[PDB]
Amino acid sequence: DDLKLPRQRVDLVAPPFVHVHEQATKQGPKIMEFKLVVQEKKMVIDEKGTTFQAMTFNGSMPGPLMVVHEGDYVEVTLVNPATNTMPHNIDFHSATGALGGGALTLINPGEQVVLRWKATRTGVFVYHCAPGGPMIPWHVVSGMNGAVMVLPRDGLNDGHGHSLRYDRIYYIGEQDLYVPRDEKGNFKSYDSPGEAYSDTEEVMRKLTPTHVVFNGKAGALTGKNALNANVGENVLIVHSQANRDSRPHLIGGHGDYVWETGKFSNAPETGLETWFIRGGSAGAALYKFLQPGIYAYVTHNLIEAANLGATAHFKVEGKWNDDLMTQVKAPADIPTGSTNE
Amino acid sequence: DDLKLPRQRVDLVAPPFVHVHEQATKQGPKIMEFKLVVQEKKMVIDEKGTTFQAMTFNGSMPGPLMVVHEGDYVEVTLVNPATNTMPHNIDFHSATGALGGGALTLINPGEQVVLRWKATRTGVFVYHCAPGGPMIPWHVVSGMNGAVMVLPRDGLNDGHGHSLRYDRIYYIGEQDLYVPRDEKGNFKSYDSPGEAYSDTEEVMRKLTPTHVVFNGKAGALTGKNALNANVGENVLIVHSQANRDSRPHLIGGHGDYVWETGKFSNAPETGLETWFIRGGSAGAALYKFLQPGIYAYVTHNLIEAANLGATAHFKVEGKWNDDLMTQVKAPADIPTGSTNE
Amino acid sequence: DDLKLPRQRVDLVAPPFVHVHEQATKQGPKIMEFKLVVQEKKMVIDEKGTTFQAMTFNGSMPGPLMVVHEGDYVEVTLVNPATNTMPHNIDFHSATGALGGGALTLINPGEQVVLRWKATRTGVFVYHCAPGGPMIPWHVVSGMNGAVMVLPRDGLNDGHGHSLRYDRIYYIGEQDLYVPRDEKGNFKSYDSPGEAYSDTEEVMRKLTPTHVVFNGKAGALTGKNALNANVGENVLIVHSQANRDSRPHLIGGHGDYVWETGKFSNAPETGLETWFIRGGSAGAALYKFLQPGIYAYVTHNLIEAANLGATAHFKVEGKWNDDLMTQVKAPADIPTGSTNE
Ligand SMILES: OC[C@H]1O[C@@](CO)(O[C@H]2O[C@H](CO)[C@@H](O)[C@H](O)[C@H]2O)[C@@H](O)[C@@H]1O
Ligand SMILES: OC[C@H]1O[C@@](CO)(O[C@H]2O[C@H](CO)[C@@H](O)[C@H](O)[C@H]2O)[C@@H](O)[C@@H]1O
Ligand SMILES: OC[C@H]1O[C@@](CO)(O[C@H]2O[C@H](CO)[C@@H](O)[C@H](O)[C@H]2O)[C@@H](O)[C@@H]1O
Ligand SMILES: OC[C@H]1O[C@@](CO)(O[C@H]2O[C@H](CO)[C@@H](O)[C@H](O)[C@H]2O)[C@@H](O)[C@@H]1O
Ligand SMILES: OC[C@H]1O[C@@](CO)(O[C@H]2O[C@H](CO)[C@@H](O)[C@H](O)[C@H]2O)[C@@H](O)[C@@H]1O
Ligand SMILES: OC[C@H]1O[C@@](CO)(O[C@H]2O[C@H](CO)[C@@H](O)[C@H](O)[C@H]2O)[C@@H](O)[C@@H]1O
Ligand SMILES: O=N[O-]
Ligand SMILES: O=N[O-]
Ligand SMILES: O=N[O-]
Ligand SMILES: O=N[O-]
Ligand SMILES: O=N[O-]
Ligand SMILES: O=N[O-]
Ligand SMILES: O=N[O-]
Ligand SMILES: O=N[O-]
Ligand SMILES: O=N[O-]
Ligand SMILES: [Cu+2]
Numbered sequence A, B, C: 001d002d003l004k005l006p007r008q009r010v011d012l013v014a015p016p017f018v019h020v021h022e023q024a025t026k027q028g029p030k031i032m033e034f035k036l037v038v039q040e041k042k043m044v045i046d047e048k049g050t051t052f053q054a055m056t057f058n059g060s061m062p063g064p065l066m067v068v069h070e071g072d073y074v075e076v077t078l079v080n081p082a083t084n085t086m087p088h089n090i091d092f093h094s095a096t097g098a099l100g101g102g103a104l105t106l107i108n109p110g111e112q113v114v115l116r117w118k119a120t121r122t123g124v125f126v127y128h129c130a131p132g133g134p135m136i137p138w139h140v141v142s143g144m145n146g147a148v149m150v151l152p153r154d155g156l157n158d159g160h161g162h163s164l165r166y167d168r169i170y171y172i173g174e175q176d177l178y179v180p181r182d183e184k185g186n187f188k189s190y191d192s193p194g195e196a197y198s199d200t201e202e203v204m205r206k207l208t209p210t211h212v213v214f215n216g217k218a219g220a221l222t223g224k225n226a227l228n229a230n231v232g233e234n235v236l237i238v239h240s241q242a243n244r245d246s247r248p249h250l251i252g253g254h255g256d257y258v259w260e261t262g263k264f265s266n267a268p269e270t271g272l273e274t275w276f277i278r279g280g281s282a283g284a285a286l287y288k289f290l291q292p293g294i295y296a297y298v299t300h301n302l303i304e305a306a307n308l309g310a311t312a313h314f315k316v317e318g319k320w321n322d323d324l325m326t327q328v329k330a331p332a333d334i335p336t337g338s339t340n341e
């Protein structure tokens, strides 16, 4: 027992929600214990019911958000149940050495492993499966990716000596999918990941996804699963993309404070319209809602947003501010005396 | 009449030019009145005469640049003449609430609407049509996008307490187009936007444009329409892309001061070769010309620049500086005594 | 002889290595003399032996890294031997005027030219061939691109008044290739660049590379050609991409200090997971190795990394630090008493 620190078990929750944590803490470093269970399963990924052979951490795309503080140790038990067909591992971009932990975590079905990494670098970071060779992109684009947030012990700041505190946090994992089609253009179904591989790899090679989704499917965060907020709340939106670039935008809002490269040692940028998540990274945006109503959160390639699945909704309760925006005149017939050339 | 401020009507001009404005102002906030008239029309988009069914604000791709100051109110009359076939609206990324104004501006042919938004955020911002669902990307990639610049009341600064002033401003709107082809590879023509939709959507879904153009067509800002400047002038180049990333570069020059995310609350970066406009944003670069001659302004995917339409020219008058660059020896035969392995 | 400065001849070396230079210097400005010889040749670009008709500076993809200091003059002799078939030139993104020098350097086979440019802007910069029109992207994606680094005379700094010094430097040139295929999907071979052009241009137009390689071929910097380092060394990794975006990541490491836009007048960002090289630029990352072993350096589109060629290896000698990372329990059977739902 070389490392003599208190241990705290964390119970992960499904995205887009985040497990209970403190922003600022005066507790000393701890060993933060997490469990991730690989689950291969067929999943529905669009509003027409298209299925595909997914591979997940903890049954979700993305995998759950892990939250720790700078100087904590993160002890992760990775479990690969014998119902799975493939070997799996885990690479933490937050971690130092052994390909992020991938070189120390390769497990066959029926096995588990325990990795410990010190949280020396602050920010939001991707984690993903990376078995080796062509299996690396396949496992990642099959769903095996999530994120971890390493907070400064004093919480977030604006890079100019002022504390920032969020009232709410959501984790938006964006997933690029490569679903094979038949000669007529219909999506193909398979009985196992292995059976889907060869056809999937051919789609992957042309670098054009068939779907780009938040929280694992088109429409996942719309309708009854819209994200809630209230006028005045400061909301942190963590966005990850393990394989492909994204350009997040909150329609009707802004990024008040944005860490587009995702690392809290760097001052955020202010007042952004659209920000950029480089493939293989996580970023974070804070926004204080000023108006009630529906907001769309998109990647601002609008073809991907509207036609390939990459739109979420916020439903924000409160009172409308006519000073910031008003409909001066409702739609009305163009006046007869108008000249509109 | 709740809002008791002076009103000023602005007459928009066609890009790449910009309407008359002040950089720094000591005037107080005003209500700045703008009119945008939707025009659906067939337009020529390449040097071989390819046409396509465009949808525009004020008859241009991009729509005109609107320029106001922080704290002004922007009162926009959007007009959809009865000669048009589709409903249209407007989303200002500069604005707060109601999906940028889209939720308050949906008008059928024969209607107009008046929206007012407070200019609380400084920078250059996209505006675009966003009717709903799949119509959002279609209207945007059909040409319905422009930009607005919200200047600080004191004008631009270098983020380190020094004023920056431009001698000239140009607005470069970049447009990704998705023109259908027949089985032989020739571009298809249609009699209406509605007729073009189904085939266009199929091209859009594969996320590869057929054309990438500045000011609405290949060659628009070359030849007799090159952009003018003079040695010593500080030129602001505003660049927008409503749907797709771009990587601007001034061949033979630099970005002296670049706001790649486009927001003046952030200090610019200095001395860039190439900068990055994330899809769904505007950015801005200042450059002081040091040499006369022709400059090419490109997106630095050179296939897009040279082969899909995305090159503009500057023609810069003045005297050559041999200290910065000189041809020491003109092309000459390789000397006989040379060894060139 | 207007310009009365000392002259120093530099002998270039093949990437990923870099010619001998000083980081900080107290020498005054000099005329730094470089020679680049164009070589058109067939080259092997993947592990299955696929060939293609390359065009290079000095026989390598990328062309060699040139290193000078701010205020030096760079006198480049460009040679186009009569064994070549095409005209060639050179555009330095570091240079001011005449399209970066392209407008002063066009040479036919059998000719040479001498260009001098003043190194007024600090950073890493692309150089590339740019003959005119469609020949520009073709020559660049055929291999005619490299980089130059213009160091501050005091060496690198952290943007906060502290010197940074590298123990080692590597230059990683990333190349997007567009190799034609026959109706069965096999790569086509040609006897000359001219013969390959028409088919290559058709691939280029669809903006999807067939290969994305470091140092000119899949596997170039893996196996016996892995990059060496030692625990404790600060390694500068210069990354260029003349045509297409990249997202570098050091698997198991970080970017301690990253200039993603590549320009040393801007403070670096700290502690990045993944950074972004915009097409038509160079960037640079410093990392101090903390753990021994194999590291993969990738573009973090993992399909491109694992399946299209874009992976390099570092082999790092030293002692493992169990505090930063440890395997707490090796892979073992899932305990009978476990519940893993
Ligand atoms: O800021 C640059 C810095 O990163 C360093 C910090 O000095 O270390 C990072 O990783 C180390 C792992 O132990 C820690 O010192 C540090 O707390 C963390 O940010 C150096 O390697 C370098 O100067
Ligand atoms: O996309 C090609 C072509 O395929 C068809 C079926 O023949 O539709 C498929 O592709 C659509 C777009 O991805 C999906 O909306 C649908 O689930 C799928 O069957 C055609 O309708 C389409 O033109
Ligand atoms: O700098 C962060 C800041 O944005 C705020 C300014 O305090 O507001 C922005 O939008 C508001 C709309 O009224 C204005 O206060 C402000 O002038 C503008 O930049 C906050 O919501 C937050 O601190
Ligand atoms: O691009 C496919 C194929 O189509 C042809 C006509 O058969 O040319 C078309 O496409 C060209 C590239 O976009 C355009 O230059 C031209 O306007 C268009 O007819 C072929 O020439 C080409 O191989
Ligand atoms: O920092 C902005 C600055 O770039 C300037 C420097 O004043 O010049 C750059 O190019 C010039 C070429 O002579 C040099 O003055 C300078 O050393 C270099 O960084 C201006 O044109 C402008 O303020
Ligand atoms: O990629 C299309 C198709 O072509 C084949 C040969 O018919 O393989 C070629 O393409 C592969 C992927 O790029 C390469 O691995 C190989 O060198 C090449 O012959 C098929 O195997 C493949 O499905
Ligand atoms: O140690 N107190 O939270
Ligand atoms: O299945 N993912 O939220
Ligand atoms: O672990 N690879 O399928
Ligand atoms: O109020 N004067 O410009
Ligand atoms: O048609 N646009 O400039
Ligand atoms: O308004 N949509 O076509
Ligand atoms: O001038 N001395 O290095
Ligand atoms: O051939 N290039 O390293
Ligand atoms: O110089 N062009 O082939
Ligand atoms: Cu896996």
Ligand SMILES: [Cu+2]
Binding pocket: A091, A093, A126, A128, A280, C249, C251, C300
């Ligand atoms: Cu990774």
Ligand SMILES: [Cu+2]
Binding pocket: B055, B087, B088, B089, B129, B130, B131, B139, B144
């Ligand atoms: Cu419209």
Ligand SMILES: [Cu+2]
Binding pocket: A249, A251, A300, B091, B093, B126, B128, B280
């Ligand atoms: Cu938008």
Ligand SMILES: [Cu+2]
Binding pocket: C055, C087, C088, C089, C129, C130, C131, C139, C144
């Ligand atoms: Cu060339």
Ligand SMILES: [Cu+2]
Binding pocket: B249, B251, B300, C091, C093, C126, C128, C280
């Ligand atoms: Cu260039």
